[PDB]
């Protein structure tokens, strides 16, 4: 992107295998889900009276990103940031939507996930198939908790909460694997151990920009997040600050 001018829509990542769209539209009474490779079948949820989760996997299909973006009223410079997967997590507020860029860890792998909250949709953009959001899927499907009774702002909370819980499970799992490898002096074990330590180092770097995002979502929130949902965002934020540093 060094040569390219502002506004150039180019995917900068390494995943060009998968493409699918997955929709879950729900209310108190019912839910509906489907998978498709036909972008025209997701456009009508823009105007839905009930909350929709649209998940687009394979942003290498920049034609599909542009189609969805232009129909949903997403500014071209936001579409540029969705496709540019080499950037620091951040949150940006516009009049009709909230834009969030996060990292998702899932043989440790990173991908960028973008989320757009409108009054009735969460649009989620991913690089490759596989995510940490199955527990939210399961709550929609079997009507567990309160997600089916709430709006898209609570859907955003639920997705970010799943990501944050997974993050803290993951780095506990990495600490345990590292402790075991150290009880184990073969060349493969040593180089592997040093690999897992470098991985743990990159995991813990991402807490700082994530805390900036979580802070903005509960302190002077914009109108697309309702007063009643703010306490849920405050709980996700609070969960990141529990083992505080000490000066002594």
């Amino acid at each position, epitope marked *: 992107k060094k040569g390219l*001018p*502002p*506004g*150039t*829509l*180019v995917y900068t990542g390494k995943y060009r295998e998968d493409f699918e769209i997955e929709v879950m539209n729900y209310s108190i009474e019912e839910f509906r889900e489907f998978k498709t490779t036909d972008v025209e079948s997701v*456009l*009508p949820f*823009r*105007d839905s009276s009930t909350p929709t989760w649209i998940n687009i996997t394979g942003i290498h299909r*920049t*034609d599909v990103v*542009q*189609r969805v973006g*232009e*129909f*949903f*009223g997403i*500014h*071209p*410079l*936001v579409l540029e940031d969705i496709l540019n997967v080499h950037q620091r997590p951040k*949150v*940006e*507020f*516009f*009049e*009709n939507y909230v834009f969030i860029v996060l990292k998702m860890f899932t043989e440790l792998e990173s991908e960028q996930v973008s989320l757009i909250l409108t009054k009735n949709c969460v649009l989620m953009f991913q690089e490759k198939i596989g995510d940490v959001f199955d527990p939210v899927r399961e709550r929609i499907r079997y009507n567990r908790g309160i997600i089916r009774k709430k709006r898209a702002d609570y859907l955003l909370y639920s997705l970010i909460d799943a990501l944050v819980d997974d993050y803290f499970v993951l780095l506990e799992k990495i600490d345990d694997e590292i402790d075991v490898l150290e009880e184990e002096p073969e060349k493969e074990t040593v180089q592997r151990t040093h690999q897992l330590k470098r991985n743990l180092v990159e995991l813990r770097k991402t807490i700082w920009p994530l805390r900036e995002v979580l802070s*903005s979502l509960y302190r002077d929130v914009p109108p697309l997040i309702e007063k009643e949902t703010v306490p849920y965002f405050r709980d996700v934020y609070d969960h990141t600050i529990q083992i505080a540093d000490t000066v002594e």
Partner: antibody
Amino acid sequence: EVQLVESGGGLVQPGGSLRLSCAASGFNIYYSSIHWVRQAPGKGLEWVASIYSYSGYTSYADSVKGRFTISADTSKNTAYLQMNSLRAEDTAVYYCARSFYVFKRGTKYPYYNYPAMDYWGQGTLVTVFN
Amino acid sequence: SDIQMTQSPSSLSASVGDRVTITCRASQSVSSAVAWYQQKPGKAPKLLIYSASSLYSGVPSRFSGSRSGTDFTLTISSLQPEDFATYYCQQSYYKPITFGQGTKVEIKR
């Protein structure tokens, strides 16, 4: 410095085809979004098609979708509208136009304006006949 | 599912020196993504105003635009002879792009 000049308008029959061209000078079409807008005799402005030239991404009004193809030749610096399956309601002055937007990146509240059409050619007349 | 832009009036009559007001109403929120264009007989449209209220380079300051929710107004503070013309509003928030019907500013007699 910036100029769009449309050409290629004339008589065309249903069954036939017509290619309109928009020659751009003072800027490179490669990094631009180019539009066709038409006006039927005594009527208003109607958007037809747009091309984001860097990716070749194209957009069409439902009234032309599947009949007209927009394209850009980034070595001639020229956009085209290829008109097929002509109908009497396609009779109109066709205008080419460039869009722009103003912005500043950064902060939690980025200053992002949506595009408008700064530069227009003087239009080319397409007359559909039996 | 296209956004409709309802422009009024289709025509109005005015004299030189009049304040003229032209309205456009979006069927849904288009944020501020509204532009205004002038067109004279036999000529291409010319941009006057973008993002509801930004005056385009070289356009006289007697043209102003404003917004209230989904209501958009073009104002000519003091009409001059060269301002008898057709005006169009356009939203660029959603694709497809949609134009108002137009307002013809005619000579009062």
